Amino acid sequence: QIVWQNEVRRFIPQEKKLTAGNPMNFLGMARSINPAANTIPKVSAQNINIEASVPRR
Amino acid sequence: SIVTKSIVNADAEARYLSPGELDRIKAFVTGGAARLRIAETLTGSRETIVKQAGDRLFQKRPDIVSPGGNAYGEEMTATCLRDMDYYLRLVTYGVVSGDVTPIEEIGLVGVREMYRSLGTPIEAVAQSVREMKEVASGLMSSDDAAEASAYFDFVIGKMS
Amino acid sequence: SIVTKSIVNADAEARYLSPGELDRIKAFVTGGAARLRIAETLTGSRETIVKQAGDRLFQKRPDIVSPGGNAYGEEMTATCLRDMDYYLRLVTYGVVSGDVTPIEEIGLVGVREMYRSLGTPIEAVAQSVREMKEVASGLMSSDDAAEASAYFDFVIGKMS
Amino acid sequence: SIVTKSIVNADAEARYLSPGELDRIKAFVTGGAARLRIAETLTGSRETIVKQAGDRLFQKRPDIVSPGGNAYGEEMTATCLRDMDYYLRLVTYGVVSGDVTPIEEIGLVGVREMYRSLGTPIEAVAQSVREMKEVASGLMSSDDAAEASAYFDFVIGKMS
Amino acid sequence: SIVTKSIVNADAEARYLSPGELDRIKAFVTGGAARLRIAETLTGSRETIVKQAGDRLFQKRPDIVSPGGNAYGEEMTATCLRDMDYYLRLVTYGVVSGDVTPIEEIGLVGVREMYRSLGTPIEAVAQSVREMKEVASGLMSSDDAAEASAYFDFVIGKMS
Amino acid sequence: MRMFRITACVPSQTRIRTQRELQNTYFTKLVPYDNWFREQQRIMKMGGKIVKVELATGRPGTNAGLA
Amino acid sequence: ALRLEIAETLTQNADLIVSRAANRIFTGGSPLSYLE
Amino acid sequence: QSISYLESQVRNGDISMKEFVRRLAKSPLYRKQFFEPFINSRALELAFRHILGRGPSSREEVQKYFSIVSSGGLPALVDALVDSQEYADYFGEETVPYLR
Amino acid sequence: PSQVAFASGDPIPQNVARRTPGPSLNRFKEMARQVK
Amino acid sequence: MQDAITAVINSADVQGKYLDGAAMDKLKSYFASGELRVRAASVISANAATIVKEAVAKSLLYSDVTRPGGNMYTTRRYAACIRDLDYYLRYATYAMLAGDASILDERVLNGLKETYNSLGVPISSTVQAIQAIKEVTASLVGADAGKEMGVYLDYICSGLS
Amino acid sequence: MQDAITAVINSADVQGKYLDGAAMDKLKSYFASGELRVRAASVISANAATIVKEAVAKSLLYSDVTRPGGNMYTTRRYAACIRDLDYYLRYATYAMLAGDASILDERVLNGLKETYNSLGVPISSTVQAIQAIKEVTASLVGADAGKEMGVYLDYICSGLS
Amino acid sequence: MQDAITAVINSADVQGKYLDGAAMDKLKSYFASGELRVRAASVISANAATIVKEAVAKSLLYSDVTRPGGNMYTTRRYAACIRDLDYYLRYATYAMLAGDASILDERVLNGLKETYNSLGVPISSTVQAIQAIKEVTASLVGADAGKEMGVYLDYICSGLS
Amino acid sequence: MQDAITAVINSADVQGKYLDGAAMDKLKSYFASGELRVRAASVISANAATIVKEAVAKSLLYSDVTRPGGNMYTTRRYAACIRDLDYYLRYATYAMLAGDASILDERVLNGLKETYNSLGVPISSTVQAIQAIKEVTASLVGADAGKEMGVYLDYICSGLS
């Protein structure tokens, strides 16, 4: 049995429909794999000594 | 538009446009705010008119969604509502143009052969555009309803 | 007329009138009161306009009344003023009808053959009806002169 | 493909196909079934390689999804996975064609200028493609993955 | 009528009948006995075609006999099965003539605007002639019913 | 648009030389006013006879409202 | 098929037909001396 | 796409095929399909094969018909094409034009 | 049924002969005959 | 053709006189009735096919003309008949917008009587069909616009008869 | 145009000789296939709307060509594509019953490339449409008649490509 | 051809979306400039001949081209040059009224360069003549609409070059 | 240019999707047909000069083309015609290997008709030469390879015509 009331209620515009190359197809995929961002590494350049902390090998 | 019609006719007669067409062009230019207002009203209510008119068509004529029908299937009904959105878009084009030439050049030439091929009933398509006309006229003000329903009955008259 | 040209376009394309041209006929009907007001003031001033324009014509071009011109003599100048009266009547006819079609189908096409067989200078009668449009624009209000000057300038263009 | 490359080379030397290139086309024709199997597995599992390699990329280079990064944001990570899917589809095309010229023409010429305009780290995209080849090598059989990793290798050589 | 099309085409080409066309008229005259045999079998079994097509139609598509359709009560169905008898008569005319030319002469063209003015579904009329076709193929021998179906399918193609 | 109801017979003067198909040289024609002068000149230069012509379209002597 | 076997008949004996026609027409010698 | 008015006038025969060709060529349908998408020169080159069934034959013929279509446009070009000695010689009054 | 395949079947090769010197070289043929 | 303003302009031009009140009263009447004519034409163009189908249902269906041997039996013949009927409706709409029936008695009634006499079309049945169209339009668009339509429609009836 | 019979007679006329050894074989193969080719023509001409229906439904519908921005978006363009597929099927029937592709050379392929490059019609999508045509005809008429149509349909495809 | 209205309609239609305000402002700007376009077109249609007259007097008269051996030497070629300038002025008026240069490359420019190259017409001299037309109509109409006219005149020159 | 494989890849890339089942079926068809194409290319590369030799002896020697006044009279004209036949045979071999006639459009048929029209080359005589090339090639190369070579050489003939 196929029913048309829910299809009429679920109708979406074709210009709002997603095509192949739209990155919004992978928007839910990026929701699925939530990337782990970095906590901000607070650094001050004034506390850095140029002569010593530069590598030497 | 009427500008395109007048320029095309004057070009075919190999003459400049007379003031008897120039006053018509400037009158169409000045009387544009009402057509623009009807256009943004229709594109604001572009979804709900399509939803209600599709609901009214499939409750009035269940042979469309009957087994063995042309639109039996969820994707078939989705494409039917997409065609309703197409013709509503063409009605907005004709409203904002002030002329029937966009509807004629986009979605009226070859429609009979097209739906004769696809098997879709042309009188039911005319009923769909008529139901969009009734929903839009109920949704908007009466003079604007008559102005939009003018292009709507042009579409259903070219349909049938 | 503009109504008969609209229905000529309508049965040339072999269908009913478009809603745009129906609203255009509505605009013509609503403006026809103003065109008829222009008709009243022009037919009230039908004598003084043509007399002042004829005096301006003879003042601009004295070679018409000089020997060697076409209009030498009292009956010749009377017929010249009669031609100017007919052309003023034709401009009022066009203002009433809303288009240059009555001027074209009465006294504007074939005017080259007319004044070639008469020997009359076509640039001189174009200058005469140009003085008619200047005196008319002097006597009219600004919107009425702007309305009549397009039809007058069409007479200038097709009779130059 | 390899057929087009051999035809272009033979046209460049204005000669018919050498029997070595005829043998290479013959061997590609006989061995294309394994390439079709590889491409079928990749297009069957094409979300899984992008999923795992995107996870491994966001683990190994979290500066990419750190604030101030090129792919910081939900839509930006979506476009990241979109680019990964593009390169996976290109690798399937190259596996089918047996020569890497479709990959070079579609997504390796001007890639440096494109990602330089976009501000995207080209070595990080190379890391993502390398992780895609790691996931594909885990997913496929040994000889098939060893043959299919060489197109990934050409992508790595062009981008890094 | 094959001989009608012979005379029309020979007059358009403006010469006498070619020997191949004369052999065509020989073939048509020899097959005339078989086609009139099919004709008298159809007019012997005409009524069972009408009744079985009618009630098979009313069981397959019950929308029209339902309220909202065109078939109300007894007289609408009587006019419909009269139309079914008319189209069966036209099929027998085409069979006995050897071509669909008298079908187009009495009824095969204009049917779309006919049933659009009448509100009648043209695709349902096509389906009506469809069960006319396989009921005739059931009752009459199929190797000899290929000739009758060769006009039946043209009729349903024109009304499709 | 004012027109004419004409009826004429124009025999072909070159059909014998050209060996073409035949047409009925007699015809009843509806011809517009603007084209009727050129059409009549074509008939008389071809050598045909116009045996009937009436102003079936429009009123005679209309000064305005022609097309 | 009938036209084909007629052609197969006539092409086989074409030399015979033209020889009989030439012997019917020409006198004073052998017309078949220099057949091309 | 058709003009049933002109088809009915052909069907009762008050106008013949010559007036049908004239009115159909100056109709807005032919004006849209073969006069709007072209220059006047290419338009008259197509109008020759649409009306006379042949191409333009000489430089002076192209010159004359270009002067006609410049003076009066598509209706003047169509009228000059149908009201010619060649059209009346080849297709008469009732014969459809054909590609020669 | 399978005798539909005229074009789609195996093609029948024609016997097409090489073009020979014609009667415009009759003088050179006579010249070559006297050369022998 | 000749509408109301060109008709009064031609009546003035025959006498060679400017437009006076004796024609400007009819001109004001035309400009007063113009929006009524345009709205009635809009309604008729909206319901143009329905007027034809109700007219043939109330006047032409189930008659001897649509019986076999009649003058409306075959499908091409019925298509031609409804083509004539909405031709009459559309040209009556043209004359109703124009204000005069020059278009009706010229580009419809040039040889219509003679061609119907040659074909055998029943003039009385076509008059009944036009009266059915007039009744449908009068019941559909109103009283004043209905009788304005009826003037041109029984002008068509007088032209046919 | 020319057919297989005209090609045979022209080749034998260029040779100056009769139909000696292989012309007869080609002619008898042509006449042996001819009645079944006429039957296939009858089936295709009877069902011709269904082949283009299943071809457009199989290959071109629900695609970028039919969605906005595509070359089959408007209804005029869709009806023109339907008429083009009807042209391809009908001229393939012509070439299949003539036994030679000279009709395709002189009335189809003479200007098809230039009209499609000027119009902007997608060559690959047209090729896919003709491939859908040839599998639908192979399903609806048979394998042998499907191949006999499909060699000329692939000739049209090669003319496209 | 396309005016500004049909241009923005097809620009919305090729992407398949409805009218948004970033498209509706284009129609609002066109309706703002429409009365300026109508008045400029009326002025140019009234003074069409004298624009060409003083343009040829400004640019082409007493030059090499009217002398014996020049391209506009004989009166036939002079009348053809005046006819060409009338064509350019009328179609530029059409493009100015439409607000879109579609009729220029759709009815003037698509082959005119090849025609002038075949005829030997000096394209640079015609460009200078059109520039003279631009200066004359800019002095005659005004700067605001003369700029819009000159845009399409330079469009004609760029298509000619 | 493109082969069948790159045609499938480009069509799938234009669609923006991966290779579906029908694409895999077309690829499998080309991989099935590849071996015959390779051996046909080997045969034609073996007999490249000899096919041209017997084709020109089959069609063009001792004719009006090689007689004085014909377009193959002089030695440079004969060398240019042999050069053209070598070009056609090599590019037909390339198209046979690729399974696509796109290289004939890109390299051969893009301007060769205008080239021959400017040169005065009889395209009827070249068409008969390529028909002789078809016959001699199909004599040496087999049956299905003969069909493929005949299709591509008839494409060259259709581009010429």
Ligand SMILES: *[C@@H](C)[C@H]1/C(=C/c2[nH]c(/C=C3N=C(/C=C4\NC(=O)C(CC)=C4C)C(C)=C\3CCC(=O)O)c(CCC(=O)O)c2C)NC(=O)[C@@H]1C
């Ligand atoms: C029943 C399954 C279907 C159907 C039929 C239906 N038809 C009518 C009415 C008419 N049909 C015709 C058509 C013809 N008359 C002819 O002589 C010919 C050619 C031989 C044709 C094609 C006509 C003229 C009528 C009008 C009645 C009359 O003959 O005078 C009706 C009645 C509709 C009404 O409003 O009375 C019906 C119900 N309708 C369906 O839905 C089914 C597809």
Ligand SMILES: *[C@@H](C)[C@H]1/C(=C/c2[nH]c(/C=C3N=C(/C=C4\NC(=O)C(CC)=C4C)C(C)=C\3CCC(=O)O)c(CCC(=O)O)c2C)NC(=O)[C@@H]1C
């Ligand atoms: C309700 C409207 C009816 C219904 C509709 C229906 N339509 C289709 C299929 C198509 N319709 C179109 C039409 C257009 N596309 C355009 O761009 C325009 C002009 C703006 C038109 C008119 C098209 C293109 C299709 C094909 C779908 C595609 O995009 O490729 C179907 C599907 C039929 C099928 O066999 O797939 C249906 C069901 N059917 C009804 O019965 C209602 C009356």
Ligand SMILES: *[C@@H](C)[C@H]1/C(=C/c2[nH]c(/C=C3N=C(/C=C4\NC(=O)C(CC)=C4C)C(C)=C\3CCC(=O)O)c(CCC(=O)O)c2C)NC(=O)[C@@H]1C
């Ligand atoms: C489906 C087939 C594809 C499609 C086609 C498409 N075709 C046209 C229009 C034309 N096609 C032709 C071709 C021919 N005319 C002939 O007489 C013959 C031989 C008998 C052929 C092959 C021509 C001339 C036209 C233009 C005018 C006409 O309609 O005949 C169009 C319309 C182009 C437009 O923009 O109007 C289209 C869209 N398009 C696709 O995408 C499918 C792949």
Ligand SMILES: *[C@H](C)[C@H]1/C(=C/c2[nH]c(/C=C3N=C(/C=C4\NC(=O)C(CC)=C4C)C(C)=C\3CCC(=O)O)c(CCC(=O)O)c2C)NC(=O)[C@@H]1C
């Ligand atoms: C011959 C028995 C006697 C006769 C004949 C005659 N006829 C003409 C002139 C013409 N006759 C026709 C005939 C037809 N018109 C049609 O529509 C048809 C059917 C297709 C036919 C047969 C025509 C067209 C002409 C005009 C010439 C033309 O070719 O267009 C003449 C010539 C009259 C003259 O002076 O030119 C003659 C002599 N008269 C006799 O005396 C014969 C006994």
Ligand SMILES: *[C@H](C)[C@H]1/C(=C/c2[nH]c(/C=C3N=C(/C=C4\NC(=O)C(CC)=C4C)C(C)=C\3CCC(=O)O)c(CCC(=O)O)c2C)NC(=O)[C@@H]1C
């Ligand atoms: C002038 C002395 C008097 C007169 C003239 C007049 N004529 C017309 C219109 C037409 N006259 C003709 C007749 C001809 N056809 C030909 O081929 C020739 C040359 C042999 C002639 C003389 C035609 C066809 C017309 C119609 C014009 C056309 O077809 O384009 C008119 C105009 C009538 C009107 O405008 O309704 C006039 C006035 N009448 C007079 O009063 C002068 C005394």
Ligand SMILES: *[C@H](C)[C@H]1/C(=C/c2[nH]c(/C=C3N=C(/C=C4\NC(=O)C(CC)=C4C)C(C)=C\3CCC(=O)O)c(CCC(=O)O)c2C)NC(=O)[C@@H]1C
């Ligand atoms: C229908 C009301 C009645 C009917 C009529 C009937 N009409 C035809 C066909 C024709 N109709 C016309 C009418 C016009 N053609 C025009 O161009 C115009 C001006 C707009 C009109 C008014 C004509 C000329 C015909 C002749 C042939 C044609 O189809 O054009 C027919 C067919 C005659 C035939 O069979 O040949 C009939 C029967 N008959 C009735 O019973 C209805 C009451």
Ligand SMILES: *[C@H](C)[C@H]1/C(=C/c2[nH]c(/C=C3N=C(/C=C4\NC(=O)C(CC)=C4C)C(C)=C\3CCC(=O)O)c(CCC(=O)O)c2C)NC(=O)[C@@H]1C
């Ligand atoms: C003298 C009888 C009358 C007259 C003359 C006059 N002519 C011009 C200017 C031009 N006249 C021509 C015409 C021709 N060029 C040709 O090659 C031929 C045929 C061989 C002709 C007939 C041209 C081209 C010019 C422009 C000058 C140029 O060479 O470019 C003028 C000057 C008008 C101006 O505005 O410059 C005059 C005054 N004037 C009269 O009053 C006499 C009746």
Ligand SMILES: *[C@H](C)[C@H]1/C(=C/c2[nH]c(/C=C3N=C(/C=C4\NC(=O)C(CC)=C4C)C(C)=C\3CCC(=O)O)c(CCC(=O)O)c2C)NC(=O)[C@@H]1C
């Ligand atoms: C004038 C500015 C310069 C110039 C003009 C010149 N033009 C012609 C003749 C032709 N002009 C056209 C051009 C058009 N055809 C079109 O369809 C359109 C737009 C709708 C245009 C603009 C054509 C086709 C011709 C040829 C027609 C004919 O020859 O009659 C000529 C005459 C050339 C001749 O050999 O007679 C000239 C001289 N040349 C100049 O030097 C001026 C600078």
Ligand SMILES: *[C@H](C)[C@H]1/C(=C/c2[nH]c(/C=C3N=C(/C=C4\NC(=O)C(CC)=C4C)C(C)=C\3CCC(=O)O)c(CCC(=O)O)c2C)NC(=O)[C@@H]1C
């Ligand atoms: C004789 C000294 C040697 C010889 C000759 C030979 N030639 C051919 C065939 C051809 N030769 C030419 C060459 C020319 N044609 C010209 O018009 C000119 C310049 C005026 C030249 C140099 C051509 C075109 C042919 C083809 C025949 C034709 O005219 O169509 C042959 C025949 C080879 C064949 O396969 O038929 C021969 C035998 N061969 C020798 O061994 C002698 C040393």
Ligand SMILES: *[C@H](C)[C@H]1/C(=C/c2[nH]c(/C=C3N=C(/C=C4\NC(=O)C(CC)=C4C)C(C)=C\3CCC(=O)O)c(CCC(=O)O)c2C)NC(=O)[C@@H]1C
């Ligand atoms: C041989 C089948 C017939 C024929 C040939 C012929 N051709 C020429 C001269 C040229 N042909 C070309 C064509 C090409 N351009 C390309 O890019 C390619 C490959 C894709 C080809 C095939 C060109 C450019 C020339 C000009 C070369 C040149 O300038 O010499 C000639 C020579 C004519 C001459 O030298 O005047 C000939 C004879 N003509 C025939 O009669 C043969 C039947």
